[PDB]
Design a protein around this nucleic acid. Structure first.
Ligand SMILES: Nc1nc2c(ncn2[C@@H]2O[C@H](COP(=O)(O)OP(=O)(O)OP(=O)(O)O)[C@@H](O)[C@H]2O)c(=O)[nH]1
Ligand SMILES: Nc1nc2c(ncn2[C@@H]2O[C@H](COP(=O)(O)OP(=O)(O)OP(=O)(O)O)[C@@H](O)[C@H]2O)c(=O)[nH]1
Ligand SMILES: [Mg+2]
Ligand SMILES: [Mg+2]
Lengths: 424, 50, 134, 225, 260, 386, 243
RNA sequence: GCAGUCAAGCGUUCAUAGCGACAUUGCUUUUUGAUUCUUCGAUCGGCUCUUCCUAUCAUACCGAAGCAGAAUUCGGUAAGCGUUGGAUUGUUCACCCACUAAUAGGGAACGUGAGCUGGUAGACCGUCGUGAGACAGGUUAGUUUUACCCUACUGAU
RNA sequence: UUCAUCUAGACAGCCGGACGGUGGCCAUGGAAGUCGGAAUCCGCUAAGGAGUGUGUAACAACUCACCGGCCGAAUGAACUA
């Protein structure tokens, strides 16, 4: 789920080999002598083989568990990562690493052989043999790791999308305006240059409407493309429109701009309307009779709603945003507080007690020159948080103000003043 | 952690010393000299009781 | 973390392997197990702590749904001689135990009997769930 | 996040003020620092540095070579004694083969001998009772399959061993089934689909082991065609 | 240490008997060893012996023997130096295997199975005297031993084994004689398993109580009856549960699994 | 081999050799660095330790959890009667170290310092400084020549002072003598200060004041020949081990041929010379003014000396310094108070300590009353009265 | 309304008690919690640091209305004097002898009614019934008997924790005479009294409490112009898809 | 490891013999991360306490990484300071869960044999032996005891 | 030591040129010398690759390879010890 970023780095084969073997040469001891006991020599080389095995399987386990299971996640993420990374290659590489995690077999076999070593040379050659077979296995992992590091960097940079949240797609032709709609409606770092596939990916933005988080999704582009041939950039848009439970806003841009004709726009709309069968569609015109017939074209679809507006004005934008949110929430609650009251128990009156001071009072503007000092700043003036000694007095209310810096005696000879202290 | 003999912590302390602490350390010296001189003058006054 | 304030020092009464009382009606009666968070590391020394200290524990007596299950929570009474930095030495009738999550939030909703002043000042939700302080 | 955000950031703001000068200066100082690392880096790091540098030299030599160069028998008899590929192998002492094993509380009886090297026992082995067994052939030093190479075809196969016919050391060792260097074994060859004139499938052939498998867990061998 | 002895026993054996408890044979089966014997060692024979057939009715024994004779010979047995069952049948089968292995000069028979199944007792039953140490606690045989009959059949005692199939559970491992219940911490949580497995009629005939609910209440009833209580009035639930779990396995409480 | 379990050392190898100190009065081994910009000032003072007691304070410590809250604390009380100046020493610099080239004494000196110079006072003719007093004749040519020598050379100036043990209740009759450095400027002015201060006293208010962090140098309370367990802090062997259990069993398996300086053996515990720094003065009280133990919050007239006096000490009839916590040395000893050697960058040395109350109850038991008047009032009239 | 945090906690009972005519806060390292109240309030009413038996947990240690202020037995004479000196004579302050010392957990009150733990009576608690203020009621919030923690209150509305039932809500709003609602605080908290302080004109809670929770608080307490508690009529399905 | 390919060089006074660095192929079992994970014959481990090595686990300072921040990975100087508490003897040439900033590796013994503590005489079962007895075993019970000498070390004249 | 360049000017620096068919053909959302596959030709030239690298979404721009101007005499590579 949602930001598979915590994947440790996948080093290439040679670097991984250098790491795991230098760790063995460094951590485990390096000195033994022929005059030592054969048991000591055996334990030495056994420890080396076992540590070398454990390093490789720790590394491989960090790859296998950190990477996601492309099946078993969500169909939307599955299809997205399939069109990005070629699911077959993905699974094949990870299976290669799993079967290499073989190293265990080599370690066990060669340790059990080392139990019968009758000489330093024999034990040394067996150790060398185990580590060399490990090295061969890893040398045969040169390409999958290169693939997987790249997939790691990409899948870390992918955005976190919840498919079940209140969503709205922003669709249209290339070079329409649907991306700087996202720019204007929402915080998002997206490019708006005038050419077709300026964006090659999905971009996400969030906003809050009616005390509810929504997410808008800008999608790079779709072409008319008879659909048994299309690229991995448009299949992102298609899978996003198909999977998610959103509203969807098709931007038409009724104008000679766009480098695209209105006939082609309505053609694409009629091409991709089968995805729209349950998706709460709206059309927005961003500023002759056949061109208008082409609009009742699309109005004749059963569930649709047309709007005219601009990126020139910034209120129609919020207008149409709220329209899309309202269209969604209704059949959300379809697909899916009690305040109590007294009942008249008595006549005793109750009323809010508020002094005139707060009603005569002025709010606090944090960016006015002439304002209240607010002891934060008196602290800043005298000395910081941990040094400023506030006087708990200077606030107190007395008959005489000259006695500010007085003290009350607490104890006399044996007695306590607070016990004897009455007014009378 | 940062050790006692860490250069950065010692530089920060060096910057603090010249300010709010040396003023308090220097005031006490003038106070105590003013007391030291009076403890001489009172002994002279007692010597001049004879 | 989870606690509000500094690591303050009050004497140690509750080493590892100590069964102390739970009096809330979450279901437990007893708390035993190993661990103390913020404990040092010294050869041959026992992990033992208080100061509203958080500890790992199991129900030795209670409901089976929460027996067999390790859980964090906080000392509220000790029965050792503790010193207040304001005067006198304090001590309780007994040890007391009781249950929470790692953020300091309680599985139960009310506490019986007194709870330590410094324990309540250090753990907010204990102060909200406690009706009796000292 | 969300996409190539740093590439966007570099397009919008751009990398630093002091980026290109510093990169140029790093590339310039690398010539000094390479030699600095050579005269320093004592030990394994210097050894590896030298290895890397030698490999890099060879790569560039081959690259320049490729640049500048890119600027009698018939086909069927091309590609073409009965002595085995390993006569006169090192001789093994009985002491180096058999380890002494001692039995009793006060170990005073020895009479038992453990074979230290890899072995082939058979298909129906079924260990002898302890009071009656003298020769011990441990389970870890027991091979069923070898790695047999055909000299022709440049191909190897993991074949099951069928027997041991001749270990050149003391033919007792043949009956024990000791797979020392130079040992001759029968291996199955049904995987290769060999057939004699007449149509009878061959499923057994002689091979000679080329390694000392007491040092390597592998039993590597060469077919005798 | 135990599995080294297992593989040693197998490699030394010509025949392998697999001892099962008639209460739970499929629990006590150990299929991985049979698979190893299939792939590694087809020249061994691998027969089954249902033991403790005196604890279950005759029809359950017949059902299990029918179910298992489809694959492996599967004798039934009861081990006792005085009152036995299946001794002559097993003798006949072993001398059959001997007649087949006429060239070996002797034939070794290993005894494999879970702990507390009756391997040592079967050997003591064949020899008709106490040859191997026996105890109701699981791990009395800790290392192998050769034993002789006919000058031609060598029995081998093996320690008990449990494979680490993690689909298993600590409860399933408890309700097979494997562990010593003295070392487990909360024996009370397992008594629901005892109620699940056993029949209320036998369970009330055994302890002579009656009409309980709530195994927690069952324990306290039994403790008040036995006078098994602490300094005060708390009845010792822990020790009473330990005794119940020892009785369940040792066969003081009758229980059995049905086959298909 | 590699010990299987790391653990820290037992004891500190810097506080060695753990031998008896060569003098009851610990020797000050460093005075603060001189700034010749500032007035003339003593670097140290002498005192006599007199028990301990307990106080309550109102703490204005921002950031802390007793900020604006009350705190009980222990304090040490040193009887600090005025110190008398009797001499001057000049310490010239050399490429071997510091060398004294002349010492000058005063005209008249007390029987106390003469007793310090003597070892059997009741038999002697007490002829100590007769010829020096004679050298103090008409013009004092020698005195002025050596003083001018000190002005010319000698680099740094220390002053020989002694105590007024006569004032304390201690039964010793013999004063201590000590060199105390002058840390102002102008060696000429130092010498002039001393010349004017011969035969005259210096009180402790003229060397210290409240809220000052001082160092105590003293000798620590000999206990005698002690064993490993209590002298270094080692574990004890379980029970009935061979050749005893209060010791180190051995060194391990490995074989040396010697015993090291590092292996925690038996010997003397205590009477070591120690220098403990940064103790905050809480009160500079004076004998002339009673109600020393009283406070702004209390207003209960009483001196700090508890009922029945201190234990193994008498009453405080003299000026005293109160510091917080635990200094080295036991009651009835000689301690030197030095000032801090360095400017301290802690707010602890800035907070103006205010007291609320001081405990003047009996330390010869469980004291419940601060004053005999309180005891009288609580107990009521007895049989003996009337 | 307002959100803010001191040291880093969303629970405001760690620091403060707040009524129409005074605001108590705890003394801390920094004067930022005090400044947060001074910003919205200015010098209009007393804003007072101090501890209760050297403790910061003062909204959970104390309780009062615009007419007065009850503090426990563990309170010292000096802190009591400090409160007396720093507050006007209009607020009567009293130290109570009781077994249950956490008065802000044992009691929930407004200027016209109060609920209490069902436990022990007192002479001057039965006298406070009509002396000091008015009605006391021994009641229980869905079994939670810690009413000042598990229920926030004012003169204009009331909040309870979310496991309270409609029946009990109707039964308790009859006693208080003003509308109640069940809600959560600070990303799903049942403890509302510590997580929030509120009155006739102003609300203060933690940074982590969500916008729907703030909207309910604003509704049920009548903050924004105008929010007479059936603005829930507007924000019906927001709470539906939220919960 | 075995058997090979190639080719920078070396090359009986060889152009078409031989040697051969760096690279590289096959065999090890599989292609879709299902592997239920599955052990197969060794002739020690645990207390007190000191020091040392660095081949650095943590702390300190830096470099490179698609390193946004947060966290992490690789590496350079660095041995100043630390590097735990427990369960398990049907056994541990080890593993398990917790706390922790971290729970790094080793030596000075084991290059025959050296503090303190667990792991011959009697008796029983098993295998063998005609037998006396032995062992493929297993179980049980079962007395070395300095220093007062020199040196070292620690304190004291 | 061997091989090469050099007053018809060497090496290093600066400066300028660095073209034309042509945005060569396949491919693609786009790729024009520079993501990739395969051709890799001719023309005009002093010389200028269907292009050595940086770069652009693509062009652009810069760069080297190669030529020329200024400078005015030695220089470079591979090897051995
Ligand atoms: N008239 C008008 N033109 C607009 C407006 N907003 C954007 N545009 C035009 O849209 C062009 C850029 O296209 P984008 O905003 O990137 O739309 P897009 O290309 O379909 O977005 P992506 O496909 O996601 O990359 C600009 O050249 C603008 O002229 C608008 O509000 N009014
Ligand atoms: N009722 C009944 N009890 C049996 C039978 N066989 C064995 N037992 C009992 O089961 C207990 C434990 O079984 P064991 O005889 O030790 O079997 P085992 O665990 O394989 O024996 P070891 O190899 O020594 O571990 C014994 O104490 C017997 O009392 C049987 O056939 N019937
Ligand atoms: Mg665009
Ligand atoms: Mg058993």
């Amino acid at each position: 789920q949602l930001s598979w970023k915590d994947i440790p780095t996948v080093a290439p084969a040679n670097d991984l080999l250098d790491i795991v073997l230098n760790r063995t040469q460094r951590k485990t001891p390096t000195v033994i002598r022929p005059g030592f006991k054969i048991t000591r020599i055996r334990a030495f080389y056994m420890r080396k083989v076992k540590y070398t095995g454990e390093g490789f399987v720790e590394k491989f386990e960090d790859i296998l568990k950190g990477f996601p299971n492309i099946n078993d996640v969500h169909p939307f993420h599955r299809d997205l990562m399939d069109t990005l990374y070629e699911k077959n290659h993905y699974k094949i590489s990870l299976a290669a690493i799993s079967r290499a995690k073989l190293v265990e077999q080599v370690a066990r076999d060669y340790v059990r052989l080392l139990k019968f070593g009758q000489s330093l040379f024999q034990c040394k050659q067996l150790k060398r043999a185990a580590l060399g077979r490990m090295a061969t296995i890893v040398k045969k992992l040169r390409d999958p790791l290169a693939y997987l590091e790249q997939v790691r960097q990409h899948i870390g940079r992918l955005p976190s999308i919840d498919p079940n949240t209140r969503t709205l797609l922003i669709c249209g032709y290339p070079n329409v305006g649907k991306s700087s709609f996202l720019r204007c409606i929402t915080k998002s770092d997206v490019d708006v240059q005038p050419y077709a596939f300026t964006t090659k990916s999905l971009y996400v933005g969030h906003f809050d409407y009616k005390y509810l988080r929504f997410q808008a999704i800008d999608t790079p582009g779709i072409l008319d493309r008879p659909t048994e041939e299309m690229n991995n950039i448009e299949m992102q848009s298609i899978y996003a429109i198909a999977h998610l439970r959103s509203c969807v806003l098709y931007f038409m841009d009724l104008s000679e701009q766009c480098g695209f004709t209105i006939e082609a726009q309505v053609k694409l709309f009629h091409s991709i309307k089968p995805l729209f069968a349950n998706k709460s569609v709206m059309v927005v015109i961003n500023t002759d009779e056949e061109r208008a017939q082409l609009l009742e074209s699309v109005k004749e679809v059963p569930g649709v709603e047309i709007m005219t507006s601009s990126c020139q004005l910034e209120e129609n934008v919020m207008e149409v945003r709220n329209k899309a949110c309202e269209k969604l929430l209704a059949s959300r609650i379809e697909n899916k507080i009690h305040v109590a009251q007294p009942q008249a128990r008595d006549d005793v009156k109750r009323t809010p007690f508020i002094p005139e001071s707060v009603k005569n009072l002025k709010k606090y503007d944090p960016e006015d020159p002439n304002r209240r000092k607010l002891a934060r700043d008196i602290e800043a003036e005298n000395g910081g948080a941990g040094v400023f000694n506030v006087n708990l007095k200077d606030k107190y209310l007395l008959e005489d103000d000259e006695w500010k810096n007085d003290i009350m005696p607490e104890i006399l000879d044996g007695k306590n003043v607070y016990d004897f202290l009455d007014p009378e | 952690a940062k050790s006692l003999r860490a250069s950065s912590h010692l530089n920060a302390k060096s910057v603090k010393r010249r300010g709010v602490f040396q003023k308090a350390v220097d005031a006490r010296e003038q106070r105590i000299s003013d007391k030291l001189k009076e403890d001489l003058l009172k002994q002279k006054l007692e010597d001049l009781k004879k | 973390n989870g606690a509000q304030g500094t690591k303050f020092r009050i004497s140690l009464g509750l080493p590892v392997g100590a069964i102390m009382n739970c009096a809330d009606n979450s279901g437990a009666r007893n708390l035993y197990i190993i661990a103390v968070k913020g404990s040092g590391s010294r050869l041959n020394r026992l992990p033992a702590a208080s100061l509203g200290d958080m500890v790992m524990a199991t129900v030795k007596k209670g409901k089976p749904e929460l027996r067999k299950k390790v859980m964090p929570a906080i000392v509220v009474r000790q029965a050792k001689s503790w010193r207040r930095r304001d005067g006198v030495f304090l001590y309780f009738e007994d040890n007391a135990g009781v249950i929470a999550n790692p953020k300091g939030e309680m599985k139960g909703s009310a506490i019986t009997g007194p709870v330590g002043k410094e324990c309540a000042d250090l753990w907010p939700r204990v102060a909200s769930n406690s009706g009796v302080v000292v | 996040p969300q996409n190539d955000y740093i590439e966007r950031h570099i397009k919008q703001h751009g990398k630093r003020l002091d980026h290109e000068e510093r990169k140029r200066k790093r590339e310039a100082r690398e010539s000094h620092k390479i030699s600095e690392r050579a005269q320093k880096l004592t030990g394994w790091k210097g050894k590896q540095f030298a290895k890397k540098r030698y490999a890099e030299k060879v790569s560039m030599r081959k690259k320049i070579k490729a640049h500048e160069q890119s600027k009698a028998l018939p086909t069927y008899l091309l590609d073409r004694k009965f002595s085995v590929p390993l006569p006169k192998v090192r001789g093994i002492s009985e002491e180096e083969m058999f380890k002494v094993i001692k039995t009793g509380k006060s170990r005073s009886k020895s009479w038992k001998r453990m074979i230290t090297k890899h072995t082939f026992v058979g298909e129906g082995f079924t260990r002898r009772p302890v009071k009656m067994e003298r020769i011990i052939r441990p389970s870890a030093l027991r091979q069923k399959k070898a790695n047999v190479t055909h000299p022709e075809l440049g191909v190897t196969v993991f074949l099951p061993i069928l027997a041991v016919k001749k270990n050149p050391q003391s033919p007792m060792y043949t009956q024990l089934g000791v797979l020392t260097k130079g040992t001759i074994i029968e291996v199955n060859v049904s995987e290769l689909g060999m057939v004699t004139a007449g149509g009878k499938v061959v499923w057994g052939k002689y091979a000679q082991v080329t390694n000392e498998p007491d040092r390597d867990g592998c039993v590597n061998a060469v077919l005798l065609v | 240490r135990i599995w080294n002895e297992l593989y040693k026993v197998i490699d030394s054996s010509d025949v392998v008997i697999h001892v099962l408890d008639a209460r739970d044979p499929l629990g006590t089966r150990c299929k991985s060893v049979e698979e190893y014997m299939k792939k590694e060692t087809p020249h061994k024979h691998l027969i089954y012996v249902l033991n403790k057939c005196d604890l279950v009715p005759t029809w359950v024994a017949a059902a299990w023997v029918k179910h298992l004779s489809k694959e492996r010979p599967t004798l039934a047995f009861h081990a006792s130096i005085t009152n036995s069952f299946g001794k002559g049948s097993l003798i006949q089968l072993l001398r059959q295997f001997s007649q087949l292995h006429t060239d070996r000069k002797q034939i070794s028979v290993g005894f494999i199975g879970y702990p507390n199944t009756g391997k040592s007792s079967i050997i003591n039953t064949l020899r008709k005297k106490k040859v191997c140490q026996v105890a109701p606690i699981p791990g009395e045989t800790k290392v192998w031993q050769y034993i002789t009959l006919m000058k031609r059949i060598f029995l081998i005692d093996c320690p008990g084994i449990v494979p680490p199939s993690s689909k298993d559970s600590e409860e399933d491992i408890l309700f097979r004689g494997v562990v010593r219940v003295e070392h487990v911490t909360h024996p009370e949580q397992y008594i629901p398993g005892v109620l699940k497995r056993c029949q209320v009629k036998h369970l009330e005939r055994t302890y002579e109580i009656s009409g309980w609910k709530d195994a927690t209440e069952f324990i306290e009833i039994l403790a008040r009856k036995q006078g098994r209580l602490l300094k005060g009035g708390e009845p010792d639930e822990s020790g009473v549960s330990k005794q119940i779990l020892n009785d369940f396995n040792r066969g003081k409480i009758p229980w059995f699994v049905l086959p298909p | 081999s590699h010990r299987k379990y790391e653990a820290p050392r037992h004891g500190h190898l810097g506080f060695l050799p753990r031998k008896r100190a060569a003098s009851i009065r610990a020797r000050v081994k460093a005075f603060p660095k001189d700034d010749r910009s500032k007035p003339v000032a003593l670097t140290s003072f002498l005192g006599y330790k007199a028990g301990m007691t307990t106080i309550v304070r109102d703490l204005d410590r921002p950031g802390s959890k007793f900020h604006k809250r009350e705190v009980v604390e222990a304090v040490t009380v040193v009887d600090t009667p005025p110190v008398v100046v009797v001499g001057v020493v000049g310490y010239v610099e050399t490429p071997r170290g510091l060398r004294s080239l002349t010492t000058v004494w005063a005209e008249h000196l007390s029987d106390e310092v003469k007793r310090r110079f003597y070892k059997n006072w009741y038999k002697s003719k007490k002829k100590a400084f007769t010829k020096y007093s004679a050298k103090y004749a008409q013009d004092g040519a020698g005195i002025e020549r050596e003083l001018a020598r000190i002005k010319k050379y000698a680099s740094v100036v220390r002053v020989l002072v002694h105590t007024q043990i006569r004032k304390t209740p201690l039964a010793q009759k013999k004063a201590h003598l000590a060199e105390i450095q002058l840390n102002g400027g102008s060696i000429s002015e130092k010498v002039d200060w001393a010349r004017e201060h011969f035969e005259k006293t210096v009180a402790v208010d003229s060397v210290f004041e409240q809220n000052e962090m001082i160092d105590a140098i003293a000798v620590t309370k000999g206990h005698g020949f002690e064993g490993v367990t209590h002298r270094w802090g080692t574990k004890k062997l379980p029970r009935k081990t061979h050749r005893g259990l209060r010791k180190v069993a051995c060194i391990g398996a490995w074989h040396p041929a010697h015993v090291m300086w590092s292996v925690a053996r038996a010997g003397q515990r205590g009477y070591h010379s120690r220098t403990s720094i940064n103790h905050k003065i809480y009160r500079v009280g004076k004998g002339d003014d009673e109600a020393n133990g009283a406070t702004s919050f209390d207003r209960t007239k009483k001196t700090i000396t508890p009922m029945g006096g201190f234990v193994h000490y008498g009453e405080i009839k003299n000026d005293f310094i109160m510091v917080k916590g635990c200094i080295p040395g036991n009651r009835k000893r000689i301690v030197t108070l030095r000032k801090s050697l360095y400017t301290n960058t802690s707010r602890k040395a800035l907070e103006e300590v205010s007291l609320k109350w001081i405990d003047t109850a009996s330390k010869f038991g469980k004291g419940r009353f601060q004053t005999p008047a309180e005891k009288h009032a609580f107990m009521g009239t007895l049989k003996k009265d009337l | 309304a307002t959100r803010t945090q001191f040291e880093n906690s969303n629970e405001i009972g760690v620091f403060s008690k707040l009524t129409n005519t005074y605001c108590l806060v705890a003394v801390g390292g920094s004067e930022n919690f005090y400044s947060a109240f001074e910003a919205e309030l200015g010098d209009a009413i007393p804003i007072v640091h101090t501890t209760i038996a050297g403790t910061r947990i003062i909204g959970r240690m104390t309780a009062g209305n615009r007419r007065g202020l009850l503090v426990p037995t563990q309170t010292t004479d000096q802190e009591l004097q400090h409160l007396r000196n720093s507050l006007p004579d209009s607020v009567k302050i009293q130290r109570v002898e009781e077994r249950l010392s956490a008065l802000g957990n044992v009691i929930c009150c407004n200027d016209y009614v109060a609920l209490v733990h069902p436990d022990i009576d007192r002479e001057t608690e039965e006298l406070i019934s009509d002396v000091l203020g008015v009605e006391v009621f021994r009641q229980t919030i869905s079994g939670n008997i810690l009413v000042g923690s598990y229920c926030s209150l004012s003169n204009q509305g009331g909040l309870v924790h979310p496991q309270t039932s409609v029946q009990d809500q109707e039964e308790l709003s009859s006693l208080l005479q003003v509308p109640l609602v069940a809600g959560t605080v600070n990303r799903g908290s049942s403890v509302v009294g510590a997580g929030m302080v509120v009155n006739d004109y102003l609300a203060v809670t933690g940074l982590d409490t969500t916008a729907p929770e703030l909207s309910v608080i604003e509704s049920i307490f009548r903050l924004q112009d105008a929010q007479p508690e059936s603005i829930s009529g507007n924000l019906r399905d927001t709470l539906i898809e939220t919960y």
